[PDB]
Amino acid sequence: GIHEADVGITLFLSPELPGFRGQIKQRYTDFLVNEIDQEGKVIHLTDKGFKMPKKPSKEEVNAEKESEAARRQEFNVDPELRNQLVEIFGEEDVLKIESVYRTANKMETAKDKSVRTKIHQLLREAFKNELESVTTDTNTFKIARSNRNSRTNKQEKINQTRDANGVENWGYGPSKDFIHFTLHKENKDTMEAVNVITKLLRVPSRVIRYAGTKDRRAVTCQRVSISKIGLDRLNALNRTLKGMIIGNYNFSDASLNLGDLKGNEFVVVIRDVTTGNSEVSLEEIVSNGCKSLSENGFINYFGMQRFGTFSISTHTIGRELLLSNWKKAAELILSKEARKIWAETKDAALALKQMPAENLLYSLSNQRKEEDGTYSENAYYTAIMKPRNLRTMYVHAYQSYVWNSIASKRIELHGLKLVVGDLVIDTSFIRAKAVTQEDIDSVKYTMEDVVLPSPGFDVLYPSNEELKQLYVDILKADNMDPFNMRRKVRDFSLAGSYRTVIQKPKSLEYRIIHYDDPSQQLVNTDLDILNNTRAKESGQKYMKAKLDRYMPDKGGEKTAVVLKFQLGTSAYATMALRELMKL
């Protein structure tokens, strides 16, 4: 079991202030994550799609039936392409052709590979509408009207999807390349939820796209685009969908992409709250704690999520891969029954036969154990190089490890005071810039502007030598040089991204409410609020309680701190709650 201290997380921004013990994500409705779109609006589910009419009017049909007649007769062929078409067939057939375009009739005709399809051009293009037949009986083109009898294109019998006001897609716009929608899910991964949608629609996974992944052990809302599908079927999913509801349809030419969001709005119910500190109130603790969150912020540490299952920490493996110590890297990755065999024997083939990354062992099950029963360094390399998904993930754990470590020292040394020769970004790749003693006095940049880089080959380190000295020192300890950070493999060390040192949550609002059972919910989902509002028409409202986000304070022994806030895309919600609570 690896601790916070064992991954660079050592410090707090305001350790003077008392914290409080608590438990988060007890129920799924104790963690709301609502996406914030590119503009700054929070995404909420405000409907469960639309209701399908069973009858696909009679005055609608004869309106667009008479509307078609109008344009057919009003439309005239280009005189240049007409008197040409006369030469081919004759002034009588051109009139038979013009007549089928207007009406629902077939023209007879009466007559060479070279100009067999030169006629098929001057028909399609001149009349715009299409022709029925290629050369049929003998060498004559028996061509009636385009596909449809009653409409233009056939592609333009979309008219079967008409609204009361006569709107093309059940009140939604004209069709477009992408349908954007809102995805309300409970205890499902973003990837899981969207890939359910595609599976049910019999479509490849690549049609559906999202801006960012939301917490699973939570109820979350986000926007999702999807192509090669029509509303009618997408809308029909809500009938068969398990722990997720789809709504708020909008057609658009754009698809969604990773990064099409500003951040996320969280509502966190902290349950079973105890203060310990018996000198100051809870209301006092929280109030000052949140004031510090909003004023000062928290250290934008990488959470545990980027160091994996509390065992052989991924960063210590990452270190070995970067140092090109292949045997050591593998031995660490190998440290249920299979790992007992490997430590007891050393036979890869024996160890393989134990599971119905470790599957290293397949690679080492081939090759040859040399003498000494020692696998060759060059054999371990070959074995390491067998997925880049995990391989990179390891080296990334080392970067994040070094970062957290440094970001701690940056605060430890100076703190929230902005020192000269620090690093910021200017709104003009993402290029850094060393801060002058001047622009400190200009108070142009504040602490929340300050960034540090991930150790890498394509990344400027702090100008300030006593900060530059951390990188060399911290890495020297693990036998690496921050300036000679390029490597020979896909372990290229990355360029090394820039990352803000602190993060201040936005619209931070706390609220203390006392309860009895862990079972009962103190926060309503968007779906809860919808169904009880949508049934203000119906009349049978569960309670006024479930129109508001928060349930009212009933009273009890137990104390919950439910608090709401927005974070950047870079920030771990855990690392925000940590600063408040001191856990």
Curated annotation (Swiss-Prot):
Family annotation (NCBIfam families): tRNA_TruD_broad (TIGR00094)
CDD domains, per the entry: PseudoU_synth_ScPUS7
Recorded catalytic activity of this chain's protein: uridine in 5S rRNA = pseudouridine in 5S rRNA; uridine in snRNA = pseudouridine in snRNA; uridine(13) in tRNA = pseudouridine(13) in tRNA; a uridine in mRNA = a pseudouridine in mRNA
Note: Present with 4150 molecules/cell in log phase SD medium.
GO MF entries: pseudouridine synthase activity; RNA binding; snRNA pseudouridine synthase activity; tRNA pseudouridine(13) synthase activity
A cellular component annotation (GO) from this entry: box H/ACA snoRNP complex
Enzyme Commission code: 5.4.99.-, 5.4.99.27
Primary role: Catalyzes pseudouridylation at position 35 in U2 snRNA stem-loop II region which induces particular conformation of the mRNA-U2 snRNA duplex and places the nucleophile in an accessible position for the first step of splicing. Also catalyzes pseudouridylation at position 56 in U2 snRNA. Also catalyzes pseudouridylation at position 50 in 5S rRNA, position 13 in cytoplasmic tRNAs, and position 35 in pre-tRNA(Tyr).
Membrane-spanning residues: none
Main location: nucleus
Nucleus among keywords: yes
Phenotype of null mutants: Decreased level of pseudouridylated mRNAs.
Gene symbol of the encoding locus: PUS7
Record's keyword annotation contains tRNA processing: yes
Organism lineage: Eukaryota, Fungi, Dikarya, Ascomycota, Saccharomycotina
Bias type Basic and acidic residues, positions: 57-72
Protein name in UniProt: Multisubstrate pseudouridine synthase 7
Region listing for Disordered, in residue ranges: 51-72
Domain TRUD: 297-504
Compartments, record wording: Nucleus; Cytoplasm
Family to which the UniProt record says this protein belongs: Belongs to the pseudouridine synthase TruD family.
InterPro entries to which the protein is assigned, alphabetical: PsdUridine_synth_cat_dom_sf, PsdUridine_synth_TruD, PsdUridine_synth_TruD_CS, PsdUridine_synth_TruD_insert, TruD_catalytic
Active-site residues, Swiss-Prot/TrEMBL: 215
GO biological process, one term: enzyme-directed rRNA pseudouridine synthesis
UniProt-reported outcome of changing residue 25 to A: Decreased pseudouridylate synthase activity
